[PDB]
């Protein structure tokens, strides 16, 4: 096996060896909760709870594309209610920027729409935003598709003006994937290429419950170590419906570090000798954001 032991220390030694050149990160809502961003797919967040005044045919209609295009006001009213007070990426986000800086980041696949990967310094080429992003918005008319930045969209959301395209006056929609929209072609094209090349899968802040994102762990080569940094263990085969194997006598490459994602990434950076680099980057970028 590539890991000398099934621990964070084993993963760090592997990352420092000549065998580990290309890292894929798979990240979800757990890497942004410490930035104040709620998990938008968690029932505990109550997205579908206080929608009475919108008179929706069904709760999920507020995130379905056909309903949105007919009645966009509920979605934008909710977007104003949930809009974050600040966009400050976490230690976890900046850990991935360090991976990029050190030439180790093959790709970050993210389920999040909060743009924090981009703010932290990952570029378009580095990212597969599996459910899109609020970072850009587009006119919904196929013949126009004018693109608008988040500052433009934010102003419309906060002034309670339904965003309309300045060229053709069609609705302008954030580039998140609504229910009933196609998933991004980039998700499938990158998956088909990246997983031929990966040396390590870093899975952070995702319960691996939403498809097709969760199936990415099964795309890794059989030898590729997979490290889960998450508050709870996840990704194992489901005894009912049925994967990660952390604990059996047959386990050989999967490792679980259970705790806050920031503390896990900090622990890994520390083992790698990157803790000062990570502290200096985070404190500098946070200072810069706080000073805007």
């Amino acid at each position: 096996r590539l890991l000398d032991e099934l621990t964070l220390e084993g993963v760090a030694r592997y990352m420092q060896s000549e065998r580990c050149r290309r890292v894929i990160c798979l990240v979800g809502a757990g890497i942004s909760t410490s930035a104040g961003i709620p998990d938008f797919r968690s029932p505990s967040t109550g997205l579908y709870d206080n929608l009475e005044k919108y008179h929706l045919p069904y709760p999920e209609a507020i995130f379905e594309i056909s309903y949105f295009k007919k009645h966009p006001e509920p979605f934008f009213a909710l977007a104003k209610e949930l809009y974050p007070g600040q966009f400050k990426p976490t230690i976890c986000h900046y850990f991935m920027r360090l991976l990029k800086d050190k030439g180790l980041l093959l790709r970050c696949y993210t389920q999040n729409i909060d743009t924090l990967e981009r703010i932290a310094g990952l570029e378009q080429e580095d990212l597969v935003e599996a459910h899109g992003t609020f970072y850009t918005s587009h006119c919904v008319s196929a013949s126009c598709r004018h693109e608008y930045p988040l500052s433009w969209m934010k102003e419309k959301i906060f002034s309670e003006v339904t965003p309309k395209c300045e060229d053709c006056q069609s609705l302008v929609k954030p580039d998140i994937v609504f229910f009933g929209e196609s998933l991004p072609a980039r998700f499938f094209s990158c998956m088909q290429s990246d997983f031929l090349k990966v040396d390590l899968l870093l899975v952070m802040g995702t319960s691996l419950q939403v498809q097709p994102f969760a199936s990415l762990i099964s795309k890794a080569p059989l030898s590729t170590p997979r490290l889960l940094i998450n508050k709870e263990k996840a990704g194992q085969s489901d005894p009912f419906l049925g994967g990660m194997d952390f604990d059996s006598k047959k386990a050989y490459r999967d490792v679980a570090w259970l705790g806050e994602c920031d503390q896990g990434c900090l622990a890994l950076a520390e083992l790698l000798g990157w803790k000062k680099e990570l502290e200096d980057l985070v404190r500098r970028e946070h200072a810069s954001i706080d000073a805007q």
Binding site: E60, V177, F178, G180, E181, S182
Partner: peptide
């Protein structure tokens, strides 16, 4: 391409 669904 496959469309986004609850699951």
């Amino acid at each position: 391409l496959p469309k986004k669904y609850g699951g």
